[PDB]
Amino acid sequence: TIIEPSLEDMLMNKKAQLVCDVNELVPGFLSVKWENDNGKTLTSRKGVTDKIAILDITYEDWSNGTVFYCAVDHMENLGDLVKKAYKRETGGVPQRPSVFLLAPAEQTSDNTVTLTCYVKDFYPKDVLVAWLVDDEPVERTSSSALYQFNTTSQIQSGRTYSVYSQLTFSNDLWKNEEVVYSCVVYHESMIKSTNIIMRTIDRTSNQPNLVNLSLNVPQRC
Amino acid sequence: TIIEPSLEDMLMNKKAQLVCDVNELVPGFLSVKWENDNGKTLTSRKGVTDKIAILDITYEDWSNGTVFYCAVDHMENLGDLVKKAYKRETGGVPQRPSVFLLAPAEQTSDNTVTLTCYVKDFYPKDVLVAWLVDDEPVERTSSSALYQFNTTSQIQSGRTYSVYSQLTFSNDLWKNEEVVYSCVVYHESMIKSTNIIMRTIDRTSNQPNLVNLSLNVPQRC
Amino acid sequence: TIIEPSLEDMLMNKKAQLVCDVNELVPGFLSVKWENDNGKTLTSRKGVTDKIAILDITYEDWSNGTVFYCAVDHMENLGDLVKKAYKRETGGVPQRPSVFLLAPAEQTSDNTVTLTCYVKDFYPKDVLVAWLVDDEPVERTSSSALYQFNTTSQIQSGRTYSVYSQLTFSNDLWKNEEVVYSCVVYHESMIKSTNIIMRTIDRTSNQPNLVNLSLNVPQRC
Amino acid sequence: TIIEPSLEDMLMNKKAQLVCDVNELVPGFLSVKWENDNGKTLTSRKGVTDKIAILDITYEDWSNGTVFYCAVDHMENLGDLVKKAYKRETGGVPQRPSVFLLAPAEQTSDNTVTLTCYVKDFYPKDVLVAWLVDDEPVERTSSSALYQFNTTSQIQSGRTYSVYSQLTFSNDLWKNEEVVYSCVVYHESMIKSTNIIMRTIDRTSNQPNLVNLSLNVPQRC
Amino acid sequence: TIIEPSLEDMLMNKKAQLVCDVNELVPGFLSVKWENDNGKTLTSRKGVTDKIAILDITYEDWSNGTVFYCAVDHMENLGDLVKKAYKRETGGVPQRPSVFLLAPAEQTSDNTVTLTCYVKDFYPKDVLVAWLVDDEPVERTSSSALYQFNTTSQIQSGRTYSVYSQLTFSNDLWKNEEVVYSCVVYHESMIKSTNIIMRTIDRTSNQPNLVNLSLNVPQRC
Amino acid sequence: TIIEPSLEDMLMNKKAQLVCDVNELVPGFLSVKWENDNGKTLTSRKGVTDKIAILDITYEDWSNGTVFYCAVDHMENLGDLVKKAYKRETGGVPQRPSVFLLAPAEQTSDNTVTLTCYVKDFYPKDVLVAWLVDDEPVERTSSSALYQFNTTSQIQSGRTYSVYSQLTFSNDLWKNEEVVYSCVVYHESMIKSTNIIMRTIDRTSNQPNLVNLSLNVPQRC
Amino acid sequence: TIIEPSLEDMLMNKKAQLVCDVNELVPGFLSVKWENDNGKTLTSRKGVTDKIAILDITYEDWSNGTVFYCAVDHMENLGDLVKKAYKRETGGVPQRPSVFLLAPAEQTSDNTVTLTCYVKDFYPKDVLVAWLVDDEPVERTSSSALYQFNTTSQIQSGRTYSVYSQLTFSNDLWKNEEVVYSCVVYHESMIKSTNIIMRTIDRTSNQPNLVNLSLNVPQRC
Amino acid sequence: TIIEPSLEDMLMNKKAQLVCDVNELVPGFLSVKWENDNGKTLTSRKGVTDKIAILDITYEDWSNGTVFYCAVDHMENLGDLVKKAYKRETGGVPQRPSVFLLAPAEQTSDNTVTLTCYVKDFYPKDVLVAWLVDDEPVERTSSSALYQFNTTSQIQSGRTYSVYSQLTFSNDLWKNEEVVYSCVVYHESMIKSTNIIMRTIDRTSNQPNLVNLSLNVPQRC
Lengths: 221, 221, 221, 221, 221, 221, 221, 221
Ligand SMILES: *[C@@H]1O[C@H](CO)[C@@H](O[C@@H]2O[C@H](CO)[C@@H](O[C@@H]3O[C@H](CO)[C@@H](O)[C@H](O)[C@@H]3O)[C@H](O)[C@H]2NC(C)=O)[C@H](O)[C@H]1NC(C)=O
Ligand SMILES: *[C@@H]1O[C@H](CO)[C@@H](O[C@@H]2O[C@H](CO)[C@@H](O[C@@H]3O[C@H](CO)[C@@H](O)[C@H](O)[C@@H]3O)[C@H](O)[C@H]2NC(C)=O)[C@H](O)[C@H]1NC(C)=O
Ligand SMILES: *[C@@H]1O[C@H](CO)[C@@H](O[C@@H]2O[C@H](CO)[C@@H](O[C@@H]3O[C@H](CO)[C@@H](O)[C@H](O)[C@@H]3O)[C@H](O)[C@H]2NC(C)=O)[C@H](O)[C@H]1NC(C)=O
Ligand SMILES: *[C@@H]1O[C@H](CO)[C@@H](O[C@@H]2O[C@H](CO)[C@@H](O[C@@H]3O[C@H](CO)[C@@H](O)[C@H](O)[C@@H]3O)[C@H](O)[C@H]2NC(C)=O)[C@H](O)[C@H]1NC(C)=O
Ligand SMILES: *[C@@H]1O[C@H](CO)[C@@H](O[C@@H]2O[C@H](CO)[C@@H](O[C@@H]3O[C@H](CO)[C@@H](O)[C@H](O)[C@@H]3O)[C@H](O)[C@H]2NC(C)=O)[C@H](O)[C@H]1NC(C)=O
Ligand SMILES: *[C@@H]1O[C@H](CO)[C@@H](O[C@@H]2O[C@H](CO)[C@@H](O[C@@H]3O[C@H](CO)[C@@H](O)[C@H](O)[C@@H]3O)[C@H](O)[C@H]2NC(C)=O)[C@H](O)[C@H]1NC(C)=O
Ligand SMILES: *[C@@H]1O[C@H](CO)[C@@H](O[C@@H]2O[C@H](CO)[C@@H](O[C@@H]3O[C@H](CO)[C@@H](O)[C@H](O)[C@@H]3O)[C@H](O)[C@H]2NC(C)=O)[C@H](O)[C@H]1NC(C)=O
Description:
Chain A is mainly β.
């Protein structure tokens, strides 16, 4: 049995859905159930399949740290109860991440270009990084067959966390057209206002004085 | 009797309040009323004073263009009815503004510095502009009124519009802060995602010059 | 009844014309009148229509703060008298604005560029901003199709005023790169010398420095 | 049970050791065993504890892709056999990775700086990265409480990989006259490529400059 | 008897005064007279001394080319009549000048600098050149004592004219300031919109790039 | 009767010719005469016409300040004597001028270009300015109509003077021939040394950028 | 017996002195003599010593190529006659040289700076090169002891010749004076106009864009 | 009798030959002889003709300053002995020479370009300079009229010396955007010192550049 954490972007609307899927498919299955910590009857809903239980959760409970239980009641497995739990690590006071958007270091001869948004020192583990091309998400922009965004794992030093996000596209488009790309960070520290943090960049508006020199001495004979 | 349009900032959360103030204070007053276009009985609420009527409106009605009526029913003015209306032009497809964040142009001497945020070609006439000093609203932060900001009036052309916004503060902070400022543009062209357009100027570092170098001396032909 | 302030540009010749238009057109009309503060018979002139009253005012009176009165004497409205007044505030000493010419705002998405001329703190409200293409006003050469200019309203911080003005044209003309533009500002604090202040821009300015090289010296041990 | 891949740095001497650890510690344990794919008796050695099996492997087998098997023979678990294996993904050919040193990310809030090393593409999933400070990787009187380094996970696209690694230290050391930092990358393609980043001060005029180098000079004493 | 042309700056207000001074002072004098071409009685007035005749002339007459006559009627010289004439060449249509601001000319030996404003190929011979420091005339400043300016004669190449004008001051103001000096050119052709043309110059305008760096990277083998 | 000062270029050979022309041509003429200050008989010569008197003068007399009187002795005018004088102001002590050669300010659009020569602070007040295209007088080369040039009049500030000289030609030549233009200033402040001061602009090459590199990988610990 | 060619600088005044000195001092001496090619009596003068014979020569004869004879008539050597000759190579039309002034190549800290003047392809072998500092000869300047100058030998390729002249002084003086230097070449092809060619140089005025970088790789152990 | 100094290039192998030629050819000749300072019998060899004496010398003697004597023993001249000597002044410490490559001298009139090599300070007054293109001697497969090289004499200020050398060729080859020209200098105080110059073009934007470098890299294979 596997559970999926509620989507962050939606909980930034004070609502979301916590689904619990069942993996014990080797034997038969009977029904899913969503219960409370005390075992009280917690109202729930049914998903596409009977092995999937959906539960609507508001920001109040999610932030407060309340723990819910998803259980499987197969006729053959009723001898035991796999009463999984949704435990959220709480405590501490949120720390605001420090976002840095780094320009690409690829040279002209290179084939593709990558933009990296790096965020450091935020305590709450859950975060989300998205990208915009000019002012529309890359996942929905018309030009979406040549952009590839990804996010790495979280590296923890002390009580805080840090991650690196990425977005890659062809060098020709980087050096041909003129648009502004933005890395958008969703984090809990910014719930009071905006609910979001952003950093923008474009080729023509960086103007870093530069000098490039390459020396090859073949030493050939 | 004067009405005030709902605050866009909170209407982006799909809810808001339309308050109705009464100006005919020269004679006495009896009661306020909030009705529909057809004159039906439209549920309302009461503000601090009896001359103030509050009405809760969702984004559905506001965007659809439904018109409400606020009326005054003074015992002496009952001969007539000042049944004001809230008319909000609806028009057609919106347009996404193109924001530009223009940097200061003053010199080392001037006592003050000014950041300009020009936002152009947004068809709907409802727009809001805020500023963030480092990551939090400039209105509330460590700055004890050290930061001031004001927005100009709107320009028209075609069926579009345009506007500027300015943030002013002493240049001592400008050259001894090492922070990142940002102009936030609340508009309804991006109601499908984020609901905000940002442009930022980063001062956390100052590496104006860069140099790259490579040197291969293959010692084997 | 609506009044129009005397043109500043004309008043930079120590002459102008204060026109008085009548808005109470729902009933009939009889005659216009231009009087003094004391109600004395102040000589006036007549415009195209009987509802338009022209009054010639010299710089002496306008600067001194003298107040004139325009009245309507309709046969039916003679019971009352809507004796309008023209009052220009004059409490202070002028201040010289610091004009700045900000960075160009290009957008290849629509192939258009806009240049912003910003006027900083100046006490007296009366100001006027015009544009020159090379050495003649933009409204002479090709304004009919290529160039469009506009100016916003004033924003008052303390006792002083600021205003933004813009000029917009195609980016293809931007690439001509053989045209210096210039914004000229008229204001009352320059009456002693030339009545204007000028600033200029050119397509080529504030551009970074880049040097790229590759060398292959084939040595021969 | 759990196995640990052979060290890449050691394997750059054409030898290494593959250790096999046992995790089924809930019941007792009897002996470890290291066998071949066919089950033949493969000579092995014993480590500090009986639950640890060490096997010496040369570069020939490791590169060829030969698979070895580690088995546990507990007196109670003899009913079954957990004959784990060591499967290495081998295909195509090594791809020369390009490594970039990204711009530093200063943060005056806590007075720290971070340098990033980004290895773009490399087919085989095995890679190692180390940081040098004037040729002083770690424990060389500097890496005690001054410099910290970590490495992220692998992000895969198509049939290639990439990774980031970071080095963090206080900005006080970042303001020294000149210090040489390097990011050596040991990859199974015998790369051993060192990329240098330095902070230099212009001599004729004093201005901060950031220099990047890539000496490939194969000069050896 | 010598005549003085009307001031151009005043005539940019459509008014001026043509003075007639008498030089035949060796014998006595009786009275001055200002007449028309036909000898008709042309009204005039008198100045400080009886030998000075003032005549008010408007813009129309001056541009049209009308010629006035100044005569002396000494009791002894009445035998003849020295009927002076004011002839102003009219010719064809005007031309505009192309104003240029040439390079500065410094002298460390004498510790002084000089700025030149060159006007090129304007047809009408009447032109005036004035200087501004920041936005006010040089002749009226706290530093006006240490500012010297002058204009040369007119060199006629073909049908057009050219003349040079300069401004000289010490080298310390030049090095240690951020003032923008401007040369203003009044001329008849540029009369419809504004009466003047302007240019600007600043110490830090055209400079060369310079990069000077040194490096020492102790590798090891 | 009018006199012409001796040419400076020839007096830089310590010899010259002082010609005396006669203007009283309304009546007849008899003979010219060249005398001394004391009226003594000063030997002279005869020019093309009897009304022209030539007198050979060396540098000694010219510099010393000696005067000479040219007189007309017409049979009818013998009643009086128009005994003109050649008075050359002398005093002070020569001051060597400073020469500045100012490059053209024009751009690639206009079809004419101009070079400027600014000579300043020459006390004797006797200068001559010439131009050389390629070490050849502009007036004796293979393109005379293709080059035009005139100098302005002196402007005096204290006891010194200053002048401007201009050389004008088409913009096509300025981009093609790649020659070395120079401005030659004849003055008496340096008779002891070379009698001229030159300033040159060289256009025989165009290497706007120059890079210097040096490597050293000592192979000795 | 040794002869010295007449000075050129003075031959540019159409006069000079050809002196012949006697070296046969081992025996006694009687008298010097200056004769013609035909042996005719050529008038001469006597110098400081009886062994030195001076002969005044004009530029007409010197250019024509006439050969003179200087002879020694010692009482003991009268048996023979050492009738030396002054033969000038006059075999073609003069060719004007092309002079190039080269800026110093010293970078910094070199303690010395050199200025080179290279003359190219002049036919007549006789030429002189001199140097001027702020337009005053180096020999008779206040800072004469701070400057050194020298001229190399002549290298003949075909029918023409070429030379290199040099001027060396301290680097600090080069970087802390802001003066203008100039190399002046005296040659015969320029007798028509100014008798000389001249090139000028200045540190600040001549400053193309440049980049200077060095890289030591101390291979320490 | 004339002698020829030993070749420096050969002496860079610690051996050479000192040839002694005889000029007293007017009378007969008998035999040559090579002796020591003391007159002792110093072994020698015979060249093509009897009048030429060859003597093999190692670096030891040549550097030490030993002086040899060459004598002629003609049957008629035996009355005297013209015992020539080979004395090389060598009393001082060697100092490294500094080599500069001055700016090219382009003469488009003749379509030629000359490069200059300048050796600034070498104490031993024996030096050799060679030019090479593409790492090939100018006299190797490049000795045709395509290239021409020469060297000037030596100029000494005090204890040191300096020289100039030139290489001339048509500028058609100079327009080839990539060729390497080098100076190699042999001198006692060193062994070899190369200095290359190239004529490249900026890759991103066309802008010719002139590069100059001195790769001291041992690079010995
Ligand atoms: C580099 O990054 C890795 C990955 O974040 C760091 O290892 C991780 O360290 C954290 C703790 O800082 C581990 O989380 C938890 O640690 C506590 C320690 O008491 C433990 O009780 C929890 O059960 C949990 O393990 C995390 O699991 C661990 N991850 C891995 C893959 O090792 C590492 O410390 C970082 N090193 C440096 C020098 O920054
Ligand atoms: C410069 O900006 C000003 C302010 O936007 C422009 O004036 C405005 O021009 C628009 C053009 O459509 C006017 O729209 C009109 O609105 C009234 C509202 O009652 C409507 O009845 C008309 O049919 C029309 O839609 C707007 O009123 C007007 N506002 C003001 C204060 O004048 C001005 O036109 C701009 N300059 C240029 C050159 O366009
Ligand atoms: C931002 O700009 C706006 C527009 O200029 C400022 O609003 C203006 O503020 C001034 C100063 O308080 C107001 O002047 C007042 O005018 C009334 C008469 O209308 C007079 O009775 C008062 O004594 C005072 O002089 C002006 O009316 C007001 N205009 C508008 C349209 O609101 C605003 O204060 C600026 N600063 C901000 C918003 O922080
Ligand atoms: C962003 O980076 C992550 C790094 O994990 C990428 O996820 C990984 O993508 C690779 C390549 O598709 C997956 O490899 C696959 O592994 C399975 C066995 O686990 C194998 O059966 C497949 O044939 C293939 O080799 C890898 O599993 C997958 N890992 C995870 C945790 O998802 C992700 O695809 C990257 N996304 C973008 C947009 O670049
Ligand atoms: C700008 O340049 C003009 C032209 O040189 C200057 O005017 C000239 O100034 C000089 C020196 O004061 C005058 O010389 C003297 O004039 C008086 C009066 O005629 C005479 O008695 C003296 O013997 C001597 O010649 C010169 O005449 C005068 N010329 C003109 C046409 O005014 C002018 O002063 C310069 N501007 C400034 C601010 O100095
Ligand atoms: C490099 O420069 C040297 C400069 O000396 C050139 O050597 C000189 O070449 C000229 C060629 O005409 C020689 O002229 C000859 O002079 C003798 C009398 O000495 C005369 O009898 C001949 O008829 C002819 O005029 C000159 O003597 C000679 N000088 C020396 C010292 O060698 C050399 O040729 C130049 N080489 C190149 C490749 O440019
Ligand atoms: C310019 O360069 C020339 C050539 O190097 C310099 O001429 C040289 O000057 C030195 C003296 O400073 C002479 O050295 C002396 O030579 C005599 C024998 O001739 C010897 O007895 C002395 O003890 C001393 O060594 C050297 O001969 C001479 N070389 C030539 C070729 O003339 C000249 O000094 C430099 N400076 C100037 C201003 O010309």
